[PDB]
């Protein structure tokens, strides 16, 4: 997961100042499931 | 909003004012009274003498309820034609016409209502709500046979296809239906209404208007059908979402924090409903079973004792070296069932047929291993007993004992357990009302049988045959041998741990379709721990393995776990004996499930598509046969 | 990698094998052979390989072992603790 | 839907279409979300 | 909507590219900052030095979240009086006051937000959201023992009836509660608050206002209770909808298209978590069991052999005619456990007590049947062993072996598996450090025992004892005799298919209540196939049957399938042996469930109403007894 | 409800005029559960 | 009606019963009797009835049969294929 940029880079993956701080409040979520029952969708 | 409507009794109104609001009743809003209702349904009588005039309370109706009751109305509206035939509910219910819109304070409590002033709040009365629900229920009660017959008509022949298109002459379909429908079907009596209803339900059944000569799709559920339909190169969204939802429910029930805690966990919290267990006491090993005691085979002087039952009758039994008993203490409430079916217990001077066997309970301070005389038995009681019968067996000149179901319940609270230096023992052997000569009967006991134990409580747990008030789940990992697990009690913590881990196994299998030696998002957590551990410093020769080998090992370990959940507690398991690996897997499963975004495996998708195409071909073939055997004019 | 303690029947089997005069002992300089005396490293108890430095179950008879596997061993057990069993085995 | 042979729709006539499909499918309202907490 | 709000960089009225937008922050909307929060709950400190002053992000709140988080406060408001007693949350949270409405671009990415300008979008900060959730959770933590005691008070005596109406003197009820509630109950400490809470919760409890002398209903859940209440001659909508949803969930889990495919399906996709199996190797038959190999009898010249273990210790074994081994090739990773408890293995010149038994694995290039000399065994290794113990049995002058557990895990990866001619076998027999005289020991092996077999993977499937990469479900119908099914492997496809079809069985039983010889929408699909089949012209004599007979046959077939799901794979099954019928039923189940409309069985409804009336009568009798005791003043 | 007391200011639990009359229509309900799935919540 | 092939132990039982000469033969001309030679249609093997013209299982011994059941037959099996078993049975 290396990186290299030319002239300039708005983000540096291997640079300094980044933060890795897992927390219960932040968690991590996506869209796993939705409510699509036939009767309720109509 | 929700709750009840309030009126201000005084001029002062603050968010915490004392005693400022009072309930709103029907008198304040006359048009919510039953006399002013919209009697289009006809429930309220037209006779003046039959209508009461009393005050009624008011409640607030929420948008969720409004929408759901409207959908309930549409449920009825799907079958208007048969309703017209039966002359029921000529006018639609229209739930929106029973509500009155008011501006007032809304809330469950006065304190909440004091801060919540809303406008155009729908309110209703319990009697009107009951009337509406009753009308809907009456119509649904009416439509019962029509619903059943319509479903039968739809399911008689294939009407849906998993993918693609199928076709068949409508005249042929109608002829087949006329041939195969039952005699009492309402569809025969009312064809047109059935046709209209099926045209509403299914978008593939289209009727031509004879006047204008046009055909057209007439379904009303296209939006739902679109979500139910499998798009090209993708399974249905409904199916994917439902599978993910079920997996998350399984993990939530499995409860990762409790099953992976590194700290003591209370027994009532950790315990789950148990299952009975089977044993044979005679063939057990005392060094491996900690709840058995035995007289040493050196006393060599059998002695006779007398016991009394609850009714007060007296029995005789003999105790010799090698006799086995169960240490009743430290095993929690339990139920014992003994079966002697199939055994022989036949001796030259002893005939088992017609004899009685019973359970005996002893209470004494003297330890069992030192018993050499009748004075040392303490208090003894016969709890239950049964007579025996003998029948010929497969072997010639051999008679075996018929099946038996001798039962007993050990409840410690019924016993006086205040004295610490007291011992409780359970014995099963021959009993008789007459003295038994030791030479005649030489069997130490009748424990050569089948014993079934069932836990009598779900708040106590045992470890290695002794009860513990507190359990550490993570420390049970890799601490059981197969023989120890076999000899474990029915309420051992290991069984509960296995049962809880089974849900995690099912969730992983539902979420995963990976083949042999293929990495998975549910398998990489073990790989990370292995990679860190192999670099960690310790004692012994260090072996360095690349990421490919580590991933293969992790995949094999995950597959072994899915195949058999007991490996986590089995001693010396290859990879699953490490609490770090177990905890990493338990934590990683939850994140892996929660990070999904309406996805399915590529292998699963392609297999599903191929199967659906095959089913479509089968349906087309069947319809071709139907058309061939029912020719159209 | 951490380890767990053996079981009672396994210890009884170890005692029986020691007093009968057949115990598999692995020493660094000699290996699985017992012709030349040395400091024991791991021994087989009831089908389980146990590390003598911290009495942890490190392996089993079902897979071959050539060295002491990498593991977290507390190193809190001395030769004096188990010299007696070795003495009994060699005398037998 | 057999027998009873038309003024508006002739079940036994010509021109009708029976073409089951996956996109059209077939459904009604089998169930609804009516949990007491959400209903209030 | 949803996502995050975006704002135009620099100048406005110039947003034509995604690069002209940037995420909005609390700096742009000052009233979303912490300092401008309405601190009616007191969470934010009042000291200016303790309030952070930093920039924060913004997120968009959906209306579903708004409604649910608003309804969350109703749980608190149900118990406001005890909250006031504990001086907690004097002011209601009022979620809506925490939101700010703005006009902006809404989306997850700049490209999406470019075309989604909207007005009056509610936004919030994570800190404020966390504060609100924390307040709710603090109140819920506070109300715990109060809620427990309140539930105890409600459940101590019947307060709900399935149908109808009952009554009892409130004074007598209060006397009973005073006599029975526990001493430490908060109800004894706070009577009036409990009365108010229970009046709010239940509409059947009403308190008379002393000053005005009026009594009235104050329940706040009439709308919700109306759905739970069963109308006359109709079950509740709640129950009907829930049952239908559960049946649909079961079918979705059962996966009809997978279980009815006609094309090959990958083993990882088809497989499900397996279960252990039990066998007795000695009593099996070689023709049925394709994974067993025997040395042919009449070889009649036993030969000795020496094998070394992993440590290096040497052992002696004897191989004679009649010895059986397990073909370890093409059976997938698996674990074997062997138990010899209850056997004898006793001869004149052989006493089992103190002997040793073990598993020996042979790798060789010569078939096992041709083995006659020690040179033909190739490589051999003893992988595990255990010592035996004996104890006297029920039979006179006989002894039996105690319970044992010898384990071995076969994983093919560790083995080389590099040459196609190599043969792998597994054998269990007596092993001794000294040579065994062939006359003393005559048993070919120790296979006369109990074997437990458990898969170690979930990605492999075996058919008739051999692994296959893919399986076609449609060809497993009616292709298994009982002997083959009994002798099959634990990871067979037949067991997986049985388990999958089980779910369909419970779904059909849930949604059907038909009696004997009664047609059903779940039974007519078989009838259609039967009719078409009898109409088909083919080889054999044809006899015509009426539609009534066909319906009866279909109903009986469906009942048989429900009774025992395993009949679908059994050879020569009456009607279920046809893949056409199986596919028809599997496909028709989905349509039958999906076409329902809030309906229920007629017999079910009648039984439910009768049972509810009976329970109501019982409740009234109990209340009459309660009133007869504890007489009212 | 509420065992024994003697205050008799606003409501009298041990007094007369109160009615205990359970029925199906009134029932008894609280807030048992809510729809808080991550996908729907967003 | 679809049909399935018989199993190995059933075929073995067929061979055995042929070599002790008790195989039951069904012919349309003679029914289940075997006194008069006729072209076989079905045989009983391993407790299952098999149609010679397709070698498919068509029934079992639990239910009585009065004629050849209506089924899908490929008719790809010829008399030369299975004449040997009939010859052995008759000779026995």
Does D27 contact B221 at a Cβ distance shorter than 8 Å?
yes
| Residue F15 C-alpha, separation from nearest chain D C-alpha, in angstroms | 32
Of A35, A39, A42, the CB nearest to D30: A39
Residues whose CB is less than 8 angstroms from the CB of residue E304 and which lie 6 or more positions away in sequence, other chains included = E316, E317, E318, E374, E435, E436, E438
| B102 phi and psi angles, rounded to 5 deg | -135, 155
C31 dihedral zone (left: phi>0; alpha: psi -120 to 50; beta): left
Query: Is the backbone of residue E298 left (phi > 0), alpha (psi -120 to 50) or beta?
Result: left
| Candidate from F1, F36, F41 with C-beta closest to E174 | F1
Answer yes or no: do B204 and D21 touch at CB < 8 A.
Answer: yes
Distance separating alpha carbons of residues B75 and B89, to the nearest angstrom: 14
**Contact of chains F and A by CB distance (3 or more pairs under 8 angstroms):** yes
C 32-61 → E contacts, CB under 8 A: 32-33, 44, 47, 61
Q: Residue E213: helix, strand or coil by DSSP?
A: coil
Question: Closest Cα partner for E178 from A34, C50, F2, D26?
Answer: F2
> Given a contact as 3+ CB pairs under 8 Å, which chains touch B?
A, C, D, E, F
Q: Cβ separation of E224 and D39 shorter than 8 Å?
A: yes
Q: Best mutation site among E78, E197, E204, E269 for testing chain B: the one with the most B CBs within 10 Å?
A: E269
**CB spacing of E309 vs C63 below 8 angstroms:** no
Strand partners, B294: B324
Name the H helices within E383-477. Answer: none
Buried b (16+ CB within 10 A) or exposed e, E622-633: ebeebbeebeee
| Three-state DSSP class for residue B557 | helix
Q: Among partner residues F1, F4, F31, which is closest to E195 by beta-carbon distance? A: F1
Query: For residues B172 and B595, what is the distance between their CA atoms, to the nearest angstrom?
Result: 51
Stretch (H or E) spanning E482: helix E482-487
| Rounded Cα–Cα distance for residues E194 and E214 (Å) | 20
The residues with which F20 forms a beta bridge, in sequence order, are: E168, E205
Place of tokens 């019962």: B144
The two beta strands, B423-431 and B324-327, are antiparallel
Number of E–F residue contacts, CB under 8 Å:
162
Q: Are B167 and D18 in contact (CB under 8 A)?
A: yes
> CA geometry: angle at C17 spanning C14 and C18, to 5°?
80
Are B202 and D20 contacting, i.e. CB atoms less than 8 angstroms apart? Answer: yes
Within 13 Å and on the Cβ side, how many CA atoms surround E617? Answer: 6
C73 CB near a chain B CB, below 8 Å? Answer: yes
Kindly tell me the burial class for residue B376, based on how many C-beta atoms sit within 10 Å of its own C-beta (0-12, 13-18, 19 or more). middle
Identify from A24, A27, A28, A33 which residue to disrupt to test chain B contact, counting B C-beta atoms within 10 A and taking the largest count. Answer: A33
**Residue D11 Cα, gap to closest chain E Cα (Å):** 21
CA distance B197 to B182: 19
List chain F gaps (C–N > 2.5 A) by preceding residue: none
Residues of chain D that touch chain A, judged by Cβ-Cβ distance less than 8 Å: 27-33
Q: Determine, for residues A37 and D27 on separate chains, whether the beta-carbon distance falls below 8 Å.
A: no
The minimum CA-CA distance between A33 and chain D, rounded to whole Å, is 16
* B303-312 exposure pattern, b = at least 16 Cβ within 10 A, e = fewer: eebebebeee
Report CB contact under 8 Å: B594, F25.
no
Best mutation target, A24, A39, A41, to test chain E (most E CBs within 10 A): A39
Q: Do chains B and G touch (3 or more CB pairs under 8 A)?
A: no
Q: Are B75 and E598 in contact (CB under 8 A)?
A: yes
Kindly report the number of other CB atoms within 10 A of residue E514's CB atom.
17
Q: Please report the domains of chain G, with CATH numbers, ordered by start residue.
A: 1-90 (3.90.1630.10)
Phi then psi for residue E243, to 5 deg, are -65, -45
CB contact under 8 A, A40 and D32: yes
Q: Which chains touch D (3 or more CB pairs under 8 A)?
A: A, B, E, F
CA-to-CA dists, residue B125 to B58, D34, E207, E224, E229, angstroms: 5, 20, 20, 13, 16
- Kindly state the helix (H) or strand (E) to which residue B197 belongs, with its residue range: helix B191-201
Put simply, whether E532 touches G (Cβ < 8 Å) is no
If DSSP codes are grouped into helix, strand and coil, which group holds residue E89?
coil
State how far the Cα of B252 lies from the Cα of B246, in Å rounded to an integer: 10
Task: State whether residue B223 sits within 8 Å of chain A by CB.
Answer: yes
**Nearest partner of G39 among G22, G51, G57, judged by Cα:** G51
DSSP strand pairing (D17-18 vs B205-206): antiparallel
CA atoms of E29 and E568, how far apart (whole Å): 67
Q: Kind and range of the H or E element at E547?
A: helix E547-563
Query: What are the φ/ψ torsions at residue E304 (nearest 5 degrees)?
Result: -85, 160
Cβ-Cβ contacts under 8 Å, F42 against chain A: 31
Interface probe for B, chosen from E230, E253, E257, E518 (most Cβ of B below 10 Å), is E257
Shortest CA distance from B59: residue in chain D: D40
Q: Which residues pair with B107 in a beta bridge?
A: B4
* Minimum distance, in Å, between the CA of residue C36 and any CA atom of chain B: 22
Give B196's contacts in chain D (Cβ within 8 Å).
9
Q: Does E629 touch chain D (CB under 8 A)?
A: no
Count of pairs with CB atoms under 8 A, one residue in B, one in C: 54
- E strand or H helix at E315, and its extent? strand E314-319
Residues of A in contact with B594 (CB under 8 A): 27-30, 32
What does each C-alpha distance from E267 to B471, E272, E453, E461, E469 come to in angstroms?
Answer: 39, 10, 20, 6, 6
Q: How many CB atoms lie within 10 A of CB B264?
A: 14
The rounded distance, in Å, linking the Cα atoms of B428 and B367 is: 18
Pairing assessment for the beta strands B303-309 and B379-387 based on DSSP bridges: parallel
Helix H or strand E segment including E120: strand E117-124
Alpha helices (H) in A1-42, listed in sequence order: 38-41
**Alpha-carbon distance B611 to B604, whole Å?**
11
Please give the span between the terminal C-alpha atoms of chain C, in angstroms, as a whole number. 36
User: Tokens 């002033």 map to which residue?
Assistant: B117
Measure in Å the smallest separation between the Cα of G55 and chain E Cα atoms.
13
How far apart CA B226 and CA F27 sit, in angstroms, is 40
* Kind plus residue range of the DSSP H or E element containing B227: helix B222-228
CA distance B380 to E366: 66
Expressed in Å, this structure's resolution amounts to: 3.0
Q: For chain A, list residues whose CB is within 8 angstroms of any CB belonging to chain B.
A: 27-34, 36, 38-42
Angle at B415 between CA B414 and CA B420, to 5 degrees: 145
Three-state DSSP class for residue E338: strand
Contact B178 D21 (CB under 8 A): no
Is B103 in the C-facing interface, judged by CB distances under 8 Å? no
Buried b / exposed e along G41-63 (16+ C-beta atoms within 10 A): bbbbbbebbbbbbbbbbbbbeee
**What's phi and psi for F23, nearest 5 deg?**
-155, 165
**A42/chain D closest Cα distance in angstroms:** 8
Which residues of chain A neighbour E245 with C-beta distances below 8 Å?
37
* Residues of G whose CB is below 8 A from E289: none
Residue of D14, D28, D32 to mutate for B, most B C-beta atoms under 10 A = D28
> What are the two backbone dihedrals, phi and then psi, of residue E7, each rounded to the nearest 5 degrees?
-135, 155
> CB within 8 A of E360, min separation 6: which ones?
E307, E317, E380, E381, E382, E383, E426, E427, E428, E429, E431
Phi and psi, residue E91, nearest 5°:
-120, 135
Helix axes B144-156, B170-180, angle to 10 degrees: 120
Residues of A in contact with D29 (CB under 8 A): 38-39, 42
Q: What is the DSSP string of B568-630?
A: GTBTT-TTTT-HHHHHHHHHHHHHHHHT--S---HHHHHHHHHHHHHHHHHHHHHHHHHHHHS
User: Looking at chain C, which subunits does it touch, using at least 3 CB pairs closer than 8 Å as the criterion?
Assistant: B, E
User: Do C and B count as touching (3 or more CB pairs closer than 8 A)?
Assistant: yes
Mutate to test the interface with E, among F23, F35, F36, F38 (most CBs of E within 10 A): F23
Selection from B560, B333, B289 nearest residue B457 by Cα: B333
Tell whether E217 lies on the interface with G, counting CB pairs under 8 A. no
For residues B448 and B401, the answer to whether their CB atoms sit within 8 Å is no
Cα separation of G19 and B546, whole Å? 63
Q: Which residue of B has its CA nearest to E598?
A: B75
| Euclidean distance between the first and the last CA atom of chain F, given in angstroms as a whole number | 43
Nearest Cα residue to B392 out of B449, B339, B344, B357: B344
The verdict on a CB contact (< 8 Å) between E130 and A38 is no
- Mutate one of A27, A28, A35 to test the F interface: name it (highest F CB count within 10 A): A35
Q: How many residues does chain G have?
A: 92
Rounded distance, CA E267 to CA G37, Å? 50
DSSP state of E437: P
Residues in Cβ contact with E183 at an 8 Å cutoff, skipping those fewer than 6 apart:
none
Of C13, C33, C61, the CB nearest to E309: C61
Calpha distance E230→E608 (Å, rounded): 10
């Amino acid at each position: 997961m290396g990186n290299a940029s030319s002239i300039v880079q708005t983000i540096n993956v291997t640079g300094d100042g980044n933060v890795f701080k897992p927390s219960a409040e932040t968690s991590s979520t996506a869209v796993p499931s939705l409510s699509l029952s036939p009767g309720m969708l109509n | 909003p929700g709750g009840v409507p309030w009126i201000a009794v005084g001029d002062e109104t603050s968010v915490t004012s004392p005693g400022a609001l009072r309930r709103m009743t029907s008198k304040d809003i006359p048009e919510t009274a039953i006399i002013n209702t919209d009697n289009s349904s006809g429930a309220v009588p037209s006779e003046s003498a039959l209508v009461p005039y009393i005050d009624e309370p008011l409640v607030v109706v929420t948008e969720h309820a409004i929408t759901n009751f409207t959908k309930a109305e549409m449920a009825l509206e799907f079958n208007r034609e048969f309703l017209d035939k039966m002359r029921v509910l000529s006018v639609s219910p229209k739930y929106s016409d029973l509500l009155t819109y008011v501006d007032c304070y809304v809330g469950v409590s006065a304190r909440q209502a004091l801060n919540n002033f809303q406008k155009q709040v729908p309110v209703i009365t319990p009697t009107r709500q009951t009337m509406y629900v009753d009308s809907i229920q009456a119509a649904l009660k009416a439509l019962e046979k029509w619903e059943i017959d319509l479903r039968v008509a739809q399911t008689l022949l294939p009407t849906n296809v998993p993918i693609g298109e199928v076709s068949c002459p409508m005249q042929s379909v109608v002829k087949l239906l006329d041939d195969q429908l039952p005699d009492d079907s309402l569809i025969r009596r009312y064809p047109k209404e059935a046709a209209v209803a099926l045209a509403k339900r299914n978008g593939g059944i289209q009727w031509m208007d004879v006047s204008e000569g046009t055909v057209m799709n007439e379904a009303v559920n296209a939006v739902a059908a679109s979500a139910l339909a499998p798009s090209a190169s993708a399974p249905p969204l409904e199916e994917k979402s439902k599978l993910t939802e079920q997996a998350m429910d399984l993990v939530t029930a499995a409860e990762p924090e409790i099953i992976a805690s590194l700290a003591p966990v209370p027994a009532p919290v950790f315990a789950i409903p148990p299952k009975p267990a089977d044993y044979n006491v005679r063939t057990l090993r005392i060094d491996e079973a900690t709840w058995l005691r035995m007289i040493p085979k050196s006393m060599n002087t059998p002695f006779q004792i007398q016991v009394t039952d609850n009714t007060g009758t007296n029995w005789h039994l003999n105790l010799r070296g090698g006799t086995r008993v169960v240490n009743l203490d430290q095993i929690a409430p339990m139920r014992f069932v003994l079966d002697l079916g199939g055994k022989s217990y036949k001796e030259t001077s002893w005939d088992p047929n017609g004899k009685k066997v019973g359970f005996i309970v002893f209470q004494s301070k003297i330890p069992f291993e030192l018993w050499t005389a009748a004075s040392q038995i303490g208090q003894a009681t016969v709890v239950n007993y049964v007579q025996l019968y003998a029948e010929d067996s497969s072997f010639t000149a051999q008679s075996i004992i018929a099946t038996t179901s001798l039962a007993y319940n050990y409840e410690p609270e019924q016993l006086n357990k205040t004295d610490p230096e007291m011992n409780y023992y359970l014995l099963a052997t021959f009993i008789d009302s007459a003295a038994i000569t030791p030479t005649n009967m030489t069997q130490p006991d009748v424990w050569d049988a089948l014993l079934t134990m069932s836990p009598l409580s779900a708040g106590e747990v045992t470890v290695k045959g002794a009860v513990v008030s507190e359990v550490v789940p993570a420390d049970l990992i890799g601490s059981y041998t197969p023989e120890s697990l076999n000899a474990s009690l029915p309420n051992d913590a290991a069984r509960c741990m296995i049962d809880r881990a089974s849900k995690i196994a099912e969730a992983i299998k539902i979420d995963d379709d990976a083949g042999p030696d293929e990495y998975s998002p549910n398998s990489v957590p073990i790989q990370g721990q292995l990679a860190i551990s192999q670099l960690e410093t310790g004692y012994g020769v260090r072996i360095f393995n690349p990421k490919g080998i580590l991933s293969k090992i992790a995949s094999r370990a995950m597959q072994a776990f899915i195949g058999d959940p007991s490996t986590i507690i089995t001693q010396a398991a290859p990879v699953l004996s490490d609490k770090n690996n177990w905890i990493a897997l338990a934590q990683g499963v939850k994140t892996s499930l929660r990070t999904k975004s309406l996805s399915a495996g590529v292998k699963t998708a392609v297999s599903k598509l191929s199967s659906s195409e095959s089913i479509q071909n089968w349906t087309q073939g069947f319809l071709d046969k139907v058309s061939a055997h029912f020719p159209a004019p | 990698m951490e380890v767990c303690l053996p079981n009672g029947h396994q210890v009884v089997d170890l005692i029986n094998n020691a007093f009968e005069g057949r115990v598999s002992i692995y020493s660094a300089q000699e290996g699985w052979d017992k012709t030349i005396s040395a400091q024991p490293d791991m021994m087989v108890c009831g089908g389980a390989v146990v590390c003598m430095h911290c009495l942890g179950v490190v392996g089993s008879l079902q897979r071959k072992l050539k060295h002491l596997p990498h593991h977290r061993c507390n190193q809190q057990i001395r030769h004096q603790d188990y010299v007696d069993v070795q003495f009994a085995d060699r005398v037998t």
